[model samples]
Target: KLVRLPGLIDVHVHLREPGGTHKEDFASGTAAALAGGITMVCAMPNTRPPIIDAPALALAQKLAEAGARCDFALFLGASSENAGTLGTVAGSAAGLKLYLNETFSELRLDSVVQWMEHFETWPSHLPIVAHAEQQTVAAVLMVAQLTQRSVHICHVARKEEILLIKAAKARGLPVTCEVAPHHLFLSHDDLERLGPGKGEVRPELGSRQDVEALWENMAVIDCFASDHAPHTLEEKCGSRPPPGFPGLETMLPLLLTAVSEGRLSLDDLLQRLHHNPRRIFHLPPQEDTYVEVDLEHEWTIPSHMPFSKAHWTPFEGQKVKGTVRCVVLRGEVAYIDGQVLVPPGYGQDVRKWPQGAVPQLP
Candidate 1:
């Protein structure tokens, strides 16, 4: 049987370009998204130059519009230095990303307090996404409490962190959180399997205890994100291994496999993958945008998937249930079976607020 889902939204992704096209760029990244049934993706702003200013975001937005095969909503990186820059382009971005603990990005901050204190000044309807962990999460929530603005915690990886997010949600603070698929399906124990290049990830993969704990308390999680960071094998397998994996092409199948094992219900899977993300990000429920899947179609993930420049996937060789049959984006048949039916420059930009202000790629 075939199932239709309102276009899946990957609210977090690093479509490296204007900086690291050698790793991944607008063309390959968005193509990978469609192959996995995603139609809209929020591109993070930590590129070689980083989308830290209005001009930078504008250029990235143009690049995505000209090359992306799926819909896009790009984020602007926020830091202690770019508060004014964020305010200047806040409305145009998918949201603001506050990188607390370091990931692969060069931009980092020791404290999120100053940014949190400036929270009330941000666009009230958009999400203030955080990349903080542990103590930083606690600090973020506390600052959110004091400032009274909504904050979204990204890639939360610990039992303690889940409990903290749950508490924040309970307190009715405008706090929301997302868990990465790697965080749910993987643990520190999988590192050896990932070996030289595949296993490393930021916030550190938690213990089986932490993964189980997060799964047990799924109600607190608002959206399931891919956090789809990509890098070349040489970059990831070298002296200092960088944390990230090519994920957009495999996220659905892995989670679908999880459904097969009874770890989660289909509804829960769809909600996390599509609905919750759209709702959390204030994206529109566009009627024509849909991802059709063949529920009974089972297959093994290949060594390489088209659309992503990265040569490997962390889920390589893993078998999973279901397959993306076709994806319609902005009323165009963007992908089907093994072919992309639409060309680049077809993706439209989506938004969550002001009701009817969606913009199309040109």
Candidate 2:
């Protein structure tokens, strides 16, 4: 059976260009997205120089303009240095990515005062996307409540965190969150088999019970983002390997397998991956864009990623039931079978569209 779904959107992806192009770049990263049925990707701002200021944002935008193969948007990373002037570039980005907890990012914020400074300074229309976890999630929610601004938490993993988000929603806080496929499908138990190096990731993988809780409270999840942080196989096996996984190519098949098993519904998948992400990020539509998935094509994930520069995946050898057969972006046949027909520069930034000219949601 074939599922001709709307071109899927992945709100969280790391197309590591400008700095970490050795691992992935706009061309390779977006091509990988197309192969996996994702036609639009919201690229994160946590690059080497980071997208905190105008020059950095411009440089990243230029790179994407020339190299991207799918519809895209760039995020502005929030740092203590840019707090006072962050609002100056509000409309240029999809949102502001604030790292509340430490990761490989150059933009993690350690001070509550700095958070408040950003909260006050950033425009209320665009969301402040946070990399906060657990206790920091509560703190960020409190800050959102005080400032009356919207906050979108990144990669909610634990029981306590999702429960807290549910409670906050009940109390009427303007907050939302995304769940990474790694957290949903993999866990700490797999650490032994994946080995120390291949297993490491930020917020790490939680226990099986924690994974169970995420499935149990799926209603609290607003978006399902890949957090597609790609690092090379050599880097992953090195002594000081970075904490992340290459996820864009594997997100949909894993989710579709879950749907096949009756753990998730097609409605939930469509909402989180398509409708909800578009609404939350205020993205423009891709006219005539859609992906045709082979729902009955059972296959095992290959050891190497064909489209991305990153050669390996944590999901290697995992059997999955669905495969993307075709992808059309804005009336263009971008990907068909195993080939990406659209060249670099095929993608346009979502933020560049005029609000009045774009079609409104029904």
Candidate 3:
């Protein structure tokens, strides 16, 4: 019996549904999460129709309830037209998602002052999860100054941005941040070695020094999300392709490899990957929602065993020294020995705010 330590929660992931199915769909993406020992994932709202209101959020919940393999939450989009819909969406979602960078055209932030003012009056005090990049740095700073709402900075890929987040937190802003496995493990130099395939994604993989700075800031970072955006080989090589590498399957393995290499301790790993995300997301503590890994075991990255449709990973050839053996979720086995036990519709829909817990704006 492996000793499980709370099922992993990926706060940032892109489950392309209601659109972009050729690349990845909700069913396939959640299946990947289950296989990777992730019990809960909060998906971005930048889908085809864009989940910006109650009706769209209901549709997403319906889809997850129909086919998701692990528990899920939706992040309602906050754009110009949807600003007024925040309350309606917040009632059904985990939080409001703002695209600080230009990933999905609909998610891009416009008019920092107006966005801040819109969030200041959210009924539930739900977190505003920002995709932190250079483009929204000024907006994030301004929002921190004006609102007391909890703000989660997603994927701090750059070194200077890490310091910027620290400064925001230092100023008593209810600010938190997450770092993806790729940013922590790989660097720009790795991109040069692997070519375009390895070094894609916005806030493009930074230097070795950037990786070092990320690890250093891990002490203050609040969460570890995979940001699992998948793209087909053809799309990845297409005229206009996105820049993220698939990470759900390798998140824990790479982190465990870091532990084996003495880069991070096991306790710290749990704090970042498990404990902190639960605390920030307001999930109830349950032993059944834990993942167990055999630290002593070593594994080679397989070339084509991905549960996702992407069929490729940046870490494909890299050797990792630890692996997740099983994942227990809500008193049942979700993933066992690298295989998903629960099929689709097993995961539950997570609400925007925790039951009986309301946010107190500072």
Candidate 4:
């Protein structure tokens, strides 16, 4: 059997639409996801108009309906100034994304107490995924515990961050967290050589010790999302390369390489990439969607990969095993060898994800 795996799901991704298409958009982004063995991606809400209400959510859904190549879901953003908007549209999208610090939107909260106060009314079934790092992780966890509400942290990158999350678990809070590929797979040791494009990301890559703690305490980490942010070559390679890099096409391959190197087991890879995401996001299984890999294959990640509109990857030139050979979505072979058989609009909207199974230990 040429190892066939259930299709991967990424709960956090930025498929820039309505604006910021120069960096990335629905069509190219989903194509990249398909090539990486992922069948579903939950799109983030940092676009020009920002996905805050039902109308904006509908607009983004319209774009995905017209462009995305695989199944898709969208998350609405929560602004500090407008907590009222969150409840109104929370059900329309996947979940809420609260940026505790400033980024593309001026919607960031000034304090944790305020965040807790505003999020108290959110549905218990849904989780508020936060862009918290550093001390913010602890702050968010504390809010979740105090409010007795559930929350998810994104792209955690420090040794202390792990400690906070572990402690949150002890308090019995529904505090789940995700670590991005850049934080776990790449490091600052090689920063100088990668230039601005690959080197920059929010919660910047940590020290060797920090990376080790992530694996040492990997059990507490709930999901391993790509946090797939894309930018133009000019933006990525520019002096002030924007934080975030293209990862839709790189996360799984790099993780597969880790399995070969014994850095991570194949079972753990499946758990983090597939099982955990489905449980955390209530992602329903798509029958017959799978990707077959050539476990013996070896290849170097190249600069010329062409899935995302943002054409570069942080894993450039790195050798990876377990190459994806064929991909089938919903019982149809969408890709074989190197050719894509599916057309754009082949993607369907993820209507709803009812509760599912609990996670097993890693």
Candidate 5:
């Protein structure tokens, strides 16, 4: 069966530009998104210099303007020093990203003082996406409660973390969270199979019970972001490989497979991937854009993906139930039948959405 839906949005992706292009960049990363049925992606700001300030944001924007193949937005990385001044660059980014746990590069926060400073300064209309693990999750919520502002947690990987978020939502705390496909589908059991380095990821892979807990508490989960972090296979196999995986090309099919298995309804998937992302990020509508997916199409994910410079995927060889046949971006055919129709630089930053356009989501 063929299903046509609004162009999907991936709120979490690391295009690795302005530095680290050896792993991935806007050209390949955004191409991968279109092939994966994604029309827009919110790029993380953990590049070589990291996008924490206005000048950084401009640098990344210039890079994205030259290379992106689909619609996009750049997320400003948050640093303690930039806290009070972030408002100056507000609305220009997808949102501000805070790494409260260990991750690549240097965009992290350790003190409540730092978190509070950001909460006090960032514009209330925009979001502050956090990479907080278990206890860090609780701490972020505490800050959100204290500051009375909304926080979007990234890559929530365990049961305790989700439970904390659920309670926060129940208490009406302004908080939301996303779970990556790796955490939901691959667990500690796959670590041995993937090898030590290849299996490494921030928040790390959780136990099978943790995966089940996420699915069980699906109602509380707000979005299904890919957290599309990519590192070269050489780096992944090296003694000190970074923690991340190439996910843009595999996310949609894995979620589609889950739908076939009765794990979730298609509407549930749409709510998280399309509606919630656009709503939370406050992205403008992509008029005349949508993706056509073949729900019955079954295929094995290839080990090497052409659109991603990383060229490898953890889901390699896995059989999935659906495929994206076409992607229409703003009235133009961007991808069709395994071919990318649009050229690099076709992507427009969602932050620059033309005048008179508004975010229309359900």
Candidate 6:
């Protein structure tokens, strides 16, 4: 029998919903999650109309309940004008999200500080997930103090930033970080090879030195999130476009590749990709579900195999060594051999943390 590990949890994913269904929706996103061996996912709030308040959050919950193929949690957004909205969804969300960097709708630092302060007192212990590449180290440290809360720093792509995070961890502060598959495998060199087609995230894929430091600091990081930002080929290749890379499908393969090369140990990968996410999100470990990987198998990725409506992926031509052969969700096989066996409604929301309570790490 193949050795199996508990299901994976992705804390930062952009499964566009409510309006950007053309790009991705709860159904397609969750389908991909199940297929990718992820049993639970926490979606970002940067959707159409934005999930800034309770009503919007309720709609997202309804959609996930009705359409999602895997269990999910949501992050509530904090904006300048809508700082008051944080209270409405404080108890409902996995945490509060602040886009300190410029994103689609622009929630800047000055506007988000007030809301962050509000949560510091109201909820007190709720996690603050920061989209923090644009802010300086001083700004990030300030937010950490104001919230007096733990934080999950989005994607650490810069070389200097990795050192900064290490310094924070050394100080015994409540700071956690994540690194995406793209940053681990691809670098700025890809921009020269693939040109504008590579489409990396902000703070951009750093020099080769940055990638090396990322692996070195893997010991202190919390999780490996897909960030799973998807966009249509048309939009990606258009004259004016932003930098992002599609990751859901390739996440497992890329990480497992590192495992095969002796770059990352299986125990380390499990800690960041599976164990730590549950700990950080305060989710309970399920006794029934697990994922088994065929580490010896090698496969070539195709361009159109993604379930995501967005057809573009930076990992399109990369050769990956391992394969996610079987995914067991809640005691049954949800996916097997690149196909989904479970039907609709097989996936359910995972409530690891009690409502209105902070999760305690073991």
* Backbone clashes, each candidate: 2, 0, 7, 0, 0, 0
Candidate 5: Cα lDDT at 23 = 94
Task: Estimate, for each residue in 1-362, the C-alpha lDDT of model 6 and write its tens digit.
Answer: 35587888888888888888887888888778877778888888888868877789888888877887777788888776665546645756777777777655455557545645645544655667777773454466666667676677887777677788788888888888888888888887778665674464665777888888888878766789888887777777778665566677788888888889999889888888888887777765655889988888888777755587777677767888887889888787788887877765555556533442454343
* Cα lDDT tens digits for candidate 3, 1-362: 45456677898898888778886777789878877767888898888888877788788888878878888878788777766656645656767777767764466656776577567756545667787686475567677666655678888888788888787778777778899988887887686665774456866888899889888887777888999888787777777767777788888888888888988887887888778887777754444577787878777887644588888887777888777787778778777776777778877776632552435565
User: How well does candidate 5 score on lDDT at residue 231?
Assistant: 93
Q: Which 10 successive residues of model 3 have the least lDDT summed?
A: 351-360
TM-score of each: 0.93, 0.97, 0.92, 0.93, 0.96, 0.92
Tens digits of per-residue lDDT for model 5 on 1-362? 67998989999999999889999989999999999999999999999879988988998998899999998989898886888887667878888888887788687676889988888888777778998888999998888888888899999999999999998888888888899999998999888779998898998999999999999999999999999999999999998999999898899999999999999999999999998987778777788999999989889988887688888888877889988999999999999987999998999888886641233332
- lDDT per residue as tens, model 4, 1-362: 47888888998899989799988888888888888888999899999888877788889988988888888778888765666656545665777888886454566677776687667866656758998878877777778777777888988889999888898788777888888888887787768778656677887888988888998998988889999988877787777768888898888888888888898788888888889988777767887899898778888989846688887777888888877788899888887766677888888777543422222243
Candidate 4's TM-score reads 0.93
Candidates in order have lDDT scores of: 0.81, 0.89, 0.76, 0.80, 0.88, 0.75
RMSD of candidate 3 to the truth, in angstroms, is 2.4
Candidate 6 global lDDT = 0.75
Which stretches in model 4 have alpha-carbon errors above 4 Å? 352-362
- What CA RMSD would candidate 1 show? 3.2
State the lDDT of candidate 1 residue by residue for 1-362, as single tens digits. 78887788888998998788998988888888999898888999899789888889888878888888887788888766776546656767888888878779876765555666457566666678988889889887777777767788998889999998888778777878888888887787787877855677887888999999999998888888888888878877888878898889888888878887888888898788788887777776665789888878778888777767878877767778888898887687888997988777777666423552434343
> Worst 10-residue stretch by lDDT in candidate 4?
353-362
Error of 3 at 18 (Å): 1.8
Model 2 CA lDDT for position 19 = 92
